[model samples]
Target chain A: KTKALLQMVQQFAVDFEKRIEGSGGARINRIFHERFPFELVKMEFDEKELRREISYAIKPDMAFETIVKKQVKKIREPCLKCVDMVISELISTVRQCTKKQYPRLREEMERIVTTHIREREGRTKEQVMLLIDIELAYMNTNHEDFIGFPQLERQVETIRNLVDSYMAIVNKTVRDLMPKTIMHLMINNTKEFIFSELLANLYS
Target chain B: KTKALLQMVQQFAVDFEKRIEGSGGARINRIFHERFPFELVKMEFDEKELRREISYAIKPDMAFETIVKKQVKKIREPCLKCVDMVISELISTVRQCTKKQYPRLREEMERIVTTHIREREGRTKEQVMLLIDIELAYMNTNHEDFIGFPQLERQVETIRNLVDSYMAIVNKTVRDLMPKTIMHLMINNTKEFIFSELLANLYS
Candidate 1:
């Protein structure tokens, strides 16, 4: 009887270990796939127009200066808009992945005890009581191990790194686009121009 | 003169957009690779031993029962040790990922303004000033959009889902391993059996 019981217990542990191996892998894959869909990150812009504008800017034209100004103005909106889109996407993706509360392992242990071990027919009353006590004691001792968060914060770090890289690109691009000479001249009345044209239009 | 200026501005936008497309993709790939290193999850156990234990338990052998009990008790430390490892790994990974805070878009913008935009010369001082004002204004208006946490609470949800799945497996395995009938008989000071004969002897 003792041999049989001992073997049963050993077998149980082995089975449990197998299940963990199988299911842990499956779960990780499922979560990874669900969270990270294979999709190209988005950017909205007109490549052809951009190319044309570059050609147009190569030579100075006094007659077409107004048109050039308009073109420059046009590009600002989209550039700024792209910044918003990129940042918003970054934030949304990170937020979507991180939020929510999980039940601790101890709770799971209690639930299992009640459902699987409590009053099963195979054991006498004393055996059932003793098993419960043993299981409970084990759970209590190890409860701390089960209580806290998993290593998901890594995903958050990944997202932030991604965002930072993108932002760096944005900064570099903007910097390259607006050189010091142009910025110096624009400084004098640019604020007033922006206030009158952009802010007024936006607020109004 | 205006045409040249206009073209420059337009060209800047165009170049910025192209750079974004090219560099953004490369950066993402690089970061993704860095974050997800290929590492195998760990598990410690042997299937053959498990099978033998199950076979050994089929018939009650008083003579070999004590041996079986010792074997069964043998599995507990490893099982509990695994639990500690699993949960510890989970916690460590998540904590490592989420703990470091990242800067927002505004900070990146500020950095760009200071480093790239402030001193660069291409436009007249007026144009540069205007560009800065316009960019700053846009940032301020949309500042709120960039401010809040992008529902990072979702990561918690995902983590919980993962933990819950793991916990279920643990519960099921434990339940399966310890049945009432087998446990009832083992109840006679099983704690003592585990402590005195099982634990000390194994370590020694």
Candidate 2:
């Protein structure tokens, strides 16, 4: 039935959920987590330059926060790559689905479906990038739920602990938002819009 | 001989050197270190938010870098306080030196010398902040001496380790630079310029 197209997209949602959650991390950890470069904050402050600053009354830790911000911005690259993997995976899976469903016109349907999905991919990337920017622009240490390390003398350990904890938060945020956004902006949304695209291109 | 004016500043230098390095940190550790908040990175991440990102394919560690950066920028406040301590110490030491030299007009000499020292304090602060800026602008993980963490499975531990190592570098840099810069810009430089200021302000 013509309804197979809608059902197929829904099926993709189900299959992918299982793939992301069920595969013992073969698909998740192997593809994404394992590849991310987490040791990104390795910039060394010149001991001499720092020593010189002290003469001027400047403390060393003063420079640390800025360097961290500079290094942190770099995540944009890997994150985008992750999105690319998602895009690639999504396209590949769609191709497979189309090939099996329309065996006789497999190439034609695959081509049509991919073209439409590509459009959605563009939008998805934009949204993901925006999310990244919003998060990167500044830090809010005053969140209500934030335990606030009691200001027990700050720096070194404080910087590391805050980063460790914050990163975990970021991990959770990215993990949640990226997937849901992809589904809405690229995956499920594509399902809705792709249906019309398929009809117009195939019939008209 | 009236040579005590110059000798006092010079002697103050010797005395303060011991104050900073010799007193087992009475002035350094007690005033600065003990008060510096070392536990600054305690921001908690939303676990559920992170779990959801898996749906969009944004990995857990992907967002970790940025958050760390955001959190790391906070070292500025405490570091500045360190500089303030240095400035206060320099001023106090200068006052003591001036008072002992001109017992008859102790208040007058102290006031004149302090006025001059304050001027140098401004310059020292500017230079220190500039050093901080240069250090913060970017991270050079490509530094030759950096043992190159070999890129083995980067994140969590890697982020922590890199930050820890980098922080130690920062700490060393700060320890060495702050004292030296303070001496040059505020301490010694003040000694040089104060000669003329003491004469002009006192005589005029």
Candidate 3:
């Protein structure tokens, strides 16, 4: 899913570049416009949706009651960021109930989340990109085998935190730094944008 | 050479087992009488010789001005237990030298020896046997590349301590306790015996 998305975006970049070059007499208002880079949009959408579906599936069968308004608010979030905030809150709520109901399973889920988040933080954007693609592929192929919603949420939260932090950093600092900093900022911003959108959709 | 020696010992054990089972009377005793186990003999002798070789190999080539012997007249019988006292003293001397010459290497060697001994002590006899064979094989095949004599000595010391401690405990304790205690004792005894013997031969 991520690979297809990335390919689509890359082709868009190439096409957009060509269009710019061929617009021989540009009235300066010529625009290179597209929705969220296709790569990022696809990744974000897939991750957020998967996260949400898995969380919902685990919540009911596992006999855990999510607060009624909370679940509704999470599902009805207006934007990807809003969806992520709800996902993060929902995960924390599940953690409170999980401390007693399914401790071992909860721990396993927590481990998954912890490991994913640590990987997200410690690795380079390139590494994260590869990881995201691999994980996205795995979830898509093996969604049925997933057992713990809370755990999945935990991992999603890590991705969420990474995306949020990275977005904040790039948005705040990218404009002030030199070319090299801007380059790195652009890469990180791309990752954050992709990750946030993916996680939000996955959870949704 | 070590491979051949280790292989021959393994073959000896298998043959000894067969010969004992075939015999009606005192098979183990008869085998012991016919030939002292070559592996044990080699281990004991190698303990001394290898250490001596390493000491020489590590030393700067120099000439001795004179030989000095300290003779203790009417040495107490209890003192015989300390027959290898000089080895301990030499260990101290070598330690001091190591601390001065290669502090980092010395510390690393110490850590490796300590960790290896701890891990080896925790394993079953079958595990130790496998380790012995594997490590000996690895060493024999890669000895040239393994130019760090001190590190090798550290490992050799661990094995020597294990074997020596095992022999002492086996001789002193009841047969029923033998199996459980053997591994730990062997690890310590093997290290002690090898290091002491090596130190003795070096001074000799």
Candidate 1 local lDDT, A1-204, one digit each (tens): 223223322223222212211234325423432232222123322233322322343241221122222122222332222122212222222123221222642232223223322232122223323322332222122211122229557333322222122122222333233222122222111211211122112223
Best model per lDDT: 2
Q: In terms of docking quality, how is candidate 3 classified?
A: incorrect
TM-scores of the first chain across all predictions? 0.16, 0.46, 0.17
Q: Which should have the higher TM-score, number 1 or number 3?
A: 1
**Candidate maximizing TM-score:** 2
Per-model DockQ: 0.01, 0.04, 0.01
Q: What digit string (tens of lDDT, one per residue) describes model 3 on residues B97-184? A: 2122355445543543344334433343333233122111111101101112211222232122112112222111111122222323
- The global Cα lDDT (0 to 1) of model 3 is 0.26
* Top candidate when judged by DockQ against the true structure: 2
User: iRMS value of model 2?
Assistant: 14.3
True contacts kept of each: 0.00, 0.03, 0.00
lDDT of 2 by residue, A76-113 (tens): 55345456655555555545444334554555556666
Tell the DockQ for candidate 2: 0.04
Rank candidates, lDDT, best first: 2, 3, 1
lDDT: the better of candidates 1 and 3: 3
Question: Per candidate, chain B TM-score?
Answer: 0.18, 0.45, 0.18
CA lDDT of every candidate: 0.25, 0.43, 0.26
